[PDB]
Amino acid sequence: LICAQKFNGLTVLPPLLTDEMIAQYTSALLAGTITSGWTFGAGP
Amino acid sequence: SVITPGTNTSNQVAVLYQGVNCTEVPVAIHADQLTPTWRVYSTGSNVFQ
Numbered sequence: 635l636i637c638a639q640k641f642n643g644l645t646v647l648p649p650l651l652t653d654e655m656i657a658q659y660t661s662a663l664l665a666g667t668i669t670s671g672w673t674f675g676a677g678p
Numbered sequence: 679s680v681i682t683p684g685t686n687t688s689n690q691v692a693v694l695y696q697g698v699n700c701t702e703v704p705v706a707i708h709a710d711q712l713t714p715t716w717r718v719y720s721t722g723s724n725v726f727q
C-alpha cells in the first residue's frame with residue numbers, strides 16, 4: 635500500500651495543487667469559455 | 679526540508695518534516711529530539727499541521 639512505501643524511505647510527496655484547486659481551475663476555464671468565448675484566452 | 683527566503687532577505691527560516699503526522703512525535707520533540715537541533719523550538723513560533 636501507500637504506507638508500505640513509508641517504511642523504507644520511499645516517501646510520496648503530495649502534489650502542490652490539490653484536486654479541489656484543479657477542479658477550481660477547470661471550473662474557471664469552463665466559465666470563461668461559456669460566458670466569454672475565446673476572448674478571455676487572448677486578453678480581457 | 680527547510681523553507682527559507684534566501685539568506686539575502688533574512689536568516690530566519692522554517693522547517694517541514696515531510697510526510698509525518700507531526701501533531702504527535704515532532705511537536706513533542708524533547709531535548710535534542712528533532713534532527714536539525716535547536717530544541718528551543720519544541721513548540722516554536724507556531725506548529726501548523
Ligand SMILES: *[C@@H]1O[C@H](CO)[C@@H](O)[C@H](O)[C@H]1NC(C)=O
Pocket residue numbers: 685686687688
Ligand atoms: C541582498 O543583500 C544586499 C547586500 O546586503 C542588499 O543590498 C540587498 O538589498 C539584499 N536583497 C534582498 C532581497 O534581501
Ligand SMILES: *[C@@H]1O[C@H](CO)[C@@H](O)[C@H](O)[C@H]1NC(C)=O
Pocket residue numbers: 699701702
Ligand atoms: C494525527 O495525530 C492526531 C493526534 O494524535 C490524531 O488525532 C489524528 O487522527 C492523526 N492523523 C493521522 C492521519 O494519523
